[PDB]
Symmetry: D2
């Protein structure tokens, strides 16, 4: 299944080893101003966005919109887009690429499809993230039209947890750290990983909120029993390579509380304590949507790992070269994009809820 | 969305306060013997978790299969079923019917649809769970045809964690406890909650394994990038009311490991470890599928509560009659049913993976 | 696939030979008053309502709504319903339940699923049509809210065609004849069929229009390239048992015209002609939607027919008893219901087309 | 909706005015040899059958496969492809491009999305058709693996009907004529159209048949009640620009016949006739699948037509230059491609029909 979403549907060209990757976003309402600045910046953030960098022009990826846009506005038809990349021949980063690399999908792909494909280029992921982030930017454009914003950051790296949260600080942080007081410790954990040719796990925090201060998000986003808002958020997040757990609000701490301790209350607007994480009974309750995504440490490490080959014979896996020491960092940005895509889809699906909605659109126009 | 699944599709009649709830399971291959005993037992286990400790009643819900079955075998057409329940004459065990109880979707439903609905009967959920378990039994029947089995149990209640897991023991446990050494402490936690008219959270462990002792599950279950096995398991589980987090394999503990520690190595025939939880790259890798589901404490408890009504005014929540002290217990069984439904859907979808599959079915027959 | 529709989704219990058939319609907006009189009348019309009848009460099938309705208004959740058919004794009408009846689904079901299972009792159709007409009544309630009405009638029987169309006259006609001038000839063809223990084909005309005189239907109903309005109308109609052809507007006669003769010109108020049949570019153009559905003659006829049994041996098929001499008559009503369902689905899907629809509903209502 | 299909899913970039169009075919089983010659010839045929042509690798066409293929074999992942066109310097044909061309989608797109975009390049048409024909080539590759072939030809042009059908002859005919004895007269109709700056309609005949030694197609293709084979063929064909009617088998002639005249009898050797057109009860019965598609005359004609502009001001539409005099000709090839896509999808969906299928792939593995 290469499509994400129900009304707002993102479909991808899938995994490939070519110089061009593509995707198409179907379901965008017409009349949405295309924010090229946003699209470009999203693509920049996807690349870790550290301290020093060169003009992305002659550097990396560029998003080419092939359809769905006219004079800088969405037309309402499918928005197709391509992303070109790859330059300069590499080395190897792997000897006989005929074995199953630990924690990689090589093993499952081989058995499900039987074809000995697999090649370099950051393998499975990486490419897809580009498509997801590009698509996420359009979803963000849609959400802004109704005052909704999505943000994220890193709350934990190698077990070093953030105590306070500053999303603005995460933005200009080399590791998107939300706690400047824990940032250095987190960075040191990363440096040690690179030093020992290893990798560490991390936890990303994603949030959705109304742009207006103390203004609540729409109440009721989520569709029926099998398309609940938290269920779809979990689906998108868990579907991200490297993700092994997803929490909503209080999450795993919820199982440790008593009703008297937990149990939220109301008044006339939106709840106070956000233990629900913005989702109650499968639907948005108006509070900020809080999501925690747990990433396992990066699979590829410059160390000798025992494994087997396509024939089944025991062999050694030694992946030379530099590798991402913590995928949670780049993963946080992708999770942010996915939340935008899910939320935008729900905003559109919700338009069908009350007959008054139909009357206002059809009988008053 | 009242349908779960892609090929094996479960559709529900949705929330209903009448005497009958219906559902239909579409996509069952023909020729599967209908295990009435299994279905009956599953429905029995569903109740286990409230007023049914060693000597559980049975004078409840009767399942009527209205189609899709002929001579005790699936015909290949939709299996429609009706579940008849309820009895006696409602007295108390509740309060006003013009208020959205504390931490209830009743609030969200009003904003989404704007209708003064709702009543008693455990608000809902419990009803849909009957549909899920019934459908789950059929899914289990299909899975058995290819040697797959799904099991579950309680690994944690009120922060009291199980150390060793015995699914055999959980079956005959009043609280489905997987660890007999921690069972008494877990029960006491519930006892105190009941005595205090409170409630506590819990964690269910669900797993799938190949029936044949020392056998592997099919490798490659999971579809494309947007219908990965872990993503779909997460979608189903998080969609259960009360669930705030879902873990696969090492789960939330994965973000605290290093690559050298996490990576599952391979020997001669199989992986040396299963931190992946049976899912690698979004596809089953043959090892046991491990899922952890976290339930927050039950909202409605005898203890007086507060929140809001339908007009954002004031009201009382003195809900007479006892209330479920731990939804995780009955929730574990539903999670087991959902895993069966997801896996069975995936088993059907995987038949399309290799051309040799089509040739075998069309040309070698 | 037991579900019809994208958002307004009708799911059926499928084929069965029990005393109860069910279905569920999801996607209905909340706040729609349930017109019970309309529902009852639709069920009455489905029976081909001919000369002389009695109170539909104790006579035949009655629709039981089990969910989705509160205080005579849709709740926005799934509307599940059950229909009860025969009960008091029976008669005969059968033969050798081991052979494939010519022009019946017997052969294909046998090969696709294998399981024999084939008796009498209207085999299929009759039941499913009931589910479609009941569901269609709800769709008609939705359409009425935005001023749209669907109607139908018989324009041909045995090649005897109508010249003028009077839908009011069709409602009171024993054969739903649209042209009273050809009605007697059409009725005679039917009488000859009965006399000769044979059947005859027919053609139904289905139309959708605005209830307010000459006002245009919404323009733009239909979705993207692969869910066009004429495409979905064709899918729904051709899917009806006995249908061999579907035409939109000028239909088959379109291929006989020159561009100058076919092209519908326009003036400020709208189109000057409607050869397009209300659908242009796969979307409603505001004019009346015109559909023609061609039915093959009824399969069951009381005449010896050469066929084979499940063992492959030649045998005689002789279906004793009376049979529907012209399925197009009852079919016309089902087609009317199907058009209502497709259009209502399209009315809901169209809500996401323009950003101003979202802004109006979220930033202002 | 920019996706066609349930499992073998074709998603398109949608309408665009750029020099690049794209699509992705998801669901292809792995291990299918990519027939580049087939793909290339298919792209050739979609442009017509002129006796005088220029060698490929130039002018147009050329499908760039970006993913889903490895060493000329399908990988089982999505097959994304791109099609390029347009260069420098052209003819002309353009004047006041802000009005609604009669019989074109201009009017509905404007009302549905409110954005004017209808530019040149034939508006699109050929654009989408290139995506469908390309995708159809892959579908044909799949189908060939189990002995299924799809063929097509023109049976009527401007009212001139073919009496005999020779598909081999259609392949080499300039207008894909199935009856060489009527071809000259059919060409004359087109000639007269061009001369008069007009256009004419036509009818395409599409057929699917088995090349297997039993000469029979698989029996049982088609899914449940709402995804029947004839329903999906009708959906695909009617969704094609210019199509106003679709017939299966005896089609519109079916309604003029009596049951005794229509019913397809059987004997030891199988069906004695095929008025059903190879689809019975919504499923393939093994006989050849017969489809007739009726096209309205080409919308664009070099003649004065009264219409209005996007603002409502009445004006004259005069489309200068030459135009396709009969879109039915190129349309026939697209119809062939669409039948292949639908059949291939059905071939995959049918794999879940019998439990014996699952057992053979999972237990005998
Ligand atoms: C008496 C009672 C029984 C419940 N039964 C179940 C159950 O069997 N399974 C489950 O997952 N949740 C169950 N719930 C949870 C409700 O479906 C619902 O989640 C809750 O009332 C609202 O809290 P939440 O929407 O924040 O989860 C139950 C709750 C109560 C109060
Ligand atoms: C060098 C390298 C780069 C990676 N890039 C990303 C990335 O950008 N985003 C992401 O979410 N995961 C990324 N991953 C994670 C892998 O896609 C994933 O861990 C692996 O293929 C399968 O993990 P799973 O079995 O848990 O699904 C990367 C892994 C490696 C080794
Ligand atoms: C006695 C009789 C009654 C029928 N009733 C209906 C009906 O009410 N509506 C309908 O659309 N088809 C009706 N049919 C049509 C059959 O369901 C259908 O022809 C058959 O199962 C499959 O043929 P098909 O390939 O044309 O669908 C009826 C057929 C017979 C023989
Ligand atoms: C110059 C011209 C070329 C066309 N080319 C094709 C073609 O190659 N294949 C096709 O199926 N339709 C083709 N069409 C049909 C149009 O896409 C279509 O008839 C019309 O613009 C939209 O109205 P309709 O979709 O309701 O028929 C063509 C039309 C014109 C005017």
């Amino acid at each position: 299944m290469n499509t994400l979403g129900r009304f707002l549907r993102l479909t991808t060209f899938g995994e490939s080893h070519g110089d061009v990757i593509g995707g198409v976003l179907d379901g965008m309402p017409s009349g949405i101003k295309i924010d090229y600045a946003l699209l470009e910046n999203e693509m920049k953030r996807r690349q870790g966005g550290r301290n020093v960098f060169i003009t992305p022009r002659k550097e990396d990826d560029k998003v080419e919109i092939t359809s769905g846009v006219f004079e800088d506005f969405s037309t309402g038809t499918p928005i197709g887009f391509l992303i070109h990349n790859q330059r300069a021949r590499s080395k190897d980063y792997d000897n006989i690429k005929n074995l199953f690399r630990p924690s990689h999908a090589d093993f499952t792909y081989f058995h499900k499809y039987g074809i000995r494909d697999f090649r370099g280029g950051g393998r499975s992921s990486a490419r897809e993230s580009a498509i997801r982030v590009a698509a996420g930017a359009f979803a963000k454009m849609l959400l802004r039209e109704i005052g909704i914003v999505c943000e994220s950051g890193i709350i934990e790296i190698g077990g070093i947890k953030a105590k306070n949260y500053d999303f603005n600080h995460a933005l200009k942080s080399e590791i998107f750290a939300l706690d400047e007081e824990q940032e250095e410790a987190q960075k040191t954990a990363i440096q040690n990983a690179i030093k020992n040719h290893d990798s560490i796990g991390g936890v990303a925090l994603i949030r959705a909120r109304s742009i207006k201060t103390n203004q609540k998000l729409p109440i009721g986003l989520g569709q029926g029993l099998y398309a609940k808002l938290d269920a779809k958020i979990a689906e998108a997040m868990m579907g991200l390579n490297g993700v092994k757990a997803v929490e909503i609000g209080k999450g795993v701490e919820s199982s440790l509380l008593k009703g008297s301790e937990y149990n939220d209350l109301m008044d006339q607007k939106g709840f106070l304590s956000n233990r629900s994480g913005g989702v109650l009974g499968g639907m948005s309750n108006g509070e900020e949507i809080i999501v925690r995504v747990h990433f396992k440490p990066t699979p590829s490490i410059f160390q000798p790992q025992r494994t087997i080959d396509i024939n089944g014979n025991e062999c050694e896996c030694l992946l030379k070269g530099r590798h991402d020491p913590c995928i949670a960092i780049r993963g946080s940005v992708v999770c942010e994009s996915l939340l935008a895509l899910v939320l935008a889809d729900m905003v559109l699906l919700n338009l069908t809820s009350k007959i008054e909605y139909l009357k206002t659109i059809y009988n008053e126009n």
